[PDB]
Amino acid sequence: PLSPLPAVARAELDARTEREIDRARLRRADNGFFRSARDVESVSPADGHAVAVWWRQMTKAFMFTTLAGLGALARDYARRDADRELLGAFQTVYQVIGDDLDNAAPEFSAVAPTGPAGIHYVWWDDTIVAPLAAHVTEADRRAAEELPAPVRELLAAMDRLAAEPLGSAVQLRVVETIALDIAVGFRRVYGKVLAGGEPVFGEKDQFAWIDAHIKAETVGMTGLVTDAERGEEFVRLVEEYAGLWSAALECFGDRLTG
Amino acid sequence: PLSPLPAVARAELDARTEREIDRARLRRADNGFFRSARDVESVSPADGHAVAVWWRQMTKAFMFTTLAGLGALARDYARRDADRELLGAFQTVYQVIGDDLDNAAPEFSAVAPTGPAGIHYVWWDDTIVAPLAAHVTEADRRAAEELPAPVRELLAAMDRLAAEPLGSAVQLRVVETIALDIAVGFRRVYGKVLAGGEPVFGEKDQFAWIDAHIKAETVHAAQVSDDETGMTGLVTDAERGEEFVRLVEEYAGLWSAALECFGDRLTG
Ligand SMILES: C/C=C(/C)[C@H](N)C(=O)O
Ligand SMILES: C/C=C(/C)[C@H](N)C(=O)O
Ligand SMILES: [Fe+2]
Numbered sequence A: 001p002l003s004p005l006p007a008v009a010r011a012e013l014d015a016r017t018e019r020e021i022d023r024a025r026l027r028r029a030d031n032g033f034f035r036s037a038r039d040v041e042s043v044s045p046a047d048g049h050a051v052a053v054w055w056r057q058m059t060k061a062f063m064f065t066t067l068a069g070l071g072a073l074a075r076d077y078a079r080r081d082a083d084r085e086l087l088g089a090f091q092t093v094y095q096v097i098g099d100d101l102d103n104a105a106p107e108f109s110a111v112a113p114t115g116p117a118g119i120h121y122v123w124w125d126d127t128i129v130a131p132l133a134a135h136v137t138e139a140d141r142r143a144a145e146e147l148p149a150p151v152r153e154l155l156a157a158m159d160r161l162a163a164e165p166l167g168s169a170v171q172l173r174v175v176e177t178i179a180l181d182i183a184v185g186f187r188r189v190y191g192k193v194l195a196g197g198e199p200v201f202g203e204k205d206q207f208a209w210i211d212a213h214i215k216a217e218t219v220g221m222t223g224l225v226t227d228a229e230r231g232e233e234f235v236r237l238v239e240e241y242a243g244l245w246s247a248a249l250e251c252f253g254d255r256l257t258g
Numbered sequence B: 001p002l003s004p005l006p007a008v009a010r011a012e013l014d015a016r017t018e019r020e021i022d023r024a025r026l027r028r029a030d031n032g033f034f035r036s037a038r039d040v041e042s043v044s045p046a047d048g049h050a051v052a053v054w055w056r057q058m059t060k061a062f063m064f065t066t067l068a069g070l071g072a073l074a075r076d077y078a079r080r081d082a083d084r085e086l087l088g089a090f091q092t093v094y095q096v097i098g099d100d101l102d103n104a105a106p107e108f109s110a111v112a113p114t115g116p117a118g119i120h121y122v123w124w125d126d127t128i129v130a131p132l133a134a135h136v137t138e139a140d141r142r143a144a145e146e147l148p149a150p151v152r153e154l155l156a157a158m159d160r161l162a163a164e165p166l167g168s169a170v171q172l173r174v175v176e177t178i179a180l181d182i183a184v185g186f187r188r189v190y191g192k193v194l195a196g197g198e199p200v201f202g203e204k205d206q207f208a209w210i211d212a213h214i215k216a217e218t219v220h221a222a223q224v225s226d227d228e229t230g231m232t233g234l235v236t237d238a239e240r241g242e243e244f245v246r247l248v249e250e251y252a253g254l255w256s257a258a259l260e261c262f263g264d265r266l267t268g
């Protein structure tokens, strides 16, 4: 006695979810981050570095709170009789988390550092934040760590979803929809960071974190919804979370067009 | 601002852990389940089925509550700044319990059923519980699922450790230490279940779950006791170390009594 909603109702949940992402203006053509990454002619080290620091904290919180949300679900399945369809979707969350925590997918392990150095927020810190930080002052580095309010609200929504049995399904549903566009925007942003007249990212391998994500992203979560009430909650959480993700990315775009 | 204890203190935590597992009577020469699996002559389908159902529920709860425990710790690391030494031990937890959830390690990846059928409590259900169930009555099956008191007591501790940041380290430190001997015992037990005077499990393939664990648990035991990325590597201060050893004492005691339950049901 535990099973997913029928396919018909889960299809409607998927459709309502896609509509919430549309309305939150997260699509490739909608969000100011993707627009700015395309439009700007150059990016200062300080603006690139601040965006990179915000991203580091954002993706660190994304990974841990998604794992925390999976644990909240695990807490429930320990005593419940989840059917094999629910269990397979539970496995999927675990596999997807393992990309960020330990580079499970071969596209990642075939470029990432091993061990903790390969954790995606750490790998990002080491290969994107660190070379940018050599080109900003100590004052600017301190200021970058003072996260803008849209980023803080998103971090706060992630903390809330860490305790939700649907939280991991909400976060992955929104994030895996927008990850490609985010990674492509980063490729473009950091390809345009010059210090002096020199590219800060002048070696192909310096983009390895980004190109791997683009590659991975280039090639369901409603499967974890077990009744109509949870379905309503799922859509409601998505609406909130998508809107906050969109405001955080608009904050990236603003920083690039200051 | 978050780091493990220095190596010397962690090593003594590990030594205290091993002394506690000694004390708990969880070593193969001491626990009644390991001895009875060795000594018993034959095992009835009802008795082997009951133990299999208990094990199904126990390892189901072990895997899901260890995962919840890892989640509890992940909640903390989202709010704090764990250094890389801590993150390395964290990855160990993810990797170890991922074998039970998704057969990542090479010893399982090839033999285990794919997808949810391969989750180790499901795979045990399909390949040990179900063939035994054909030999027992529906009334028997229903009685087997009424779990004995020391099994329920272990499950309740598992539920508590689900919300503990140290919980996954406590569970993996103990379970991965005794897992080989449990699998060895199961190999012995279910080779001795007779029906029609004839062994229920006559083919090598029917032992795939058990044989895969006999191979794999050697490694899992080394991983949780490792002095660089082992379970004590998640202890971040002396007080947390105290709590760790206290939880280990409790958890190991409940595991030992649950296993004595196994041995009593194999004897009489
Ligand atoms: C591109 C977006 C992501 C969430 C990546 N998976 C990451 O690790 O930051
Ligand atoms: C043999 C003991 C275990 C905890 C196994 N890891 C299992 O899946 O039951
Ligand atoms: Fe990632």
Ligand SMILES: [Fe+2]
Residues within 6 Å of the ligand: A099, A176, A179
């Ligand atoms: Fe991803």
Ligand SMILES: [Fe+2]
Residues within 6 Å of the ligand: B099, B100, B120, B213
């Ligand atoms: Fe297992």
Ligand SMILES: [Fe+2]
Residues within 6 Å of the ligand: B099, B176, B179, B216, B217, B220
């Ligand atoms: Fe194991």
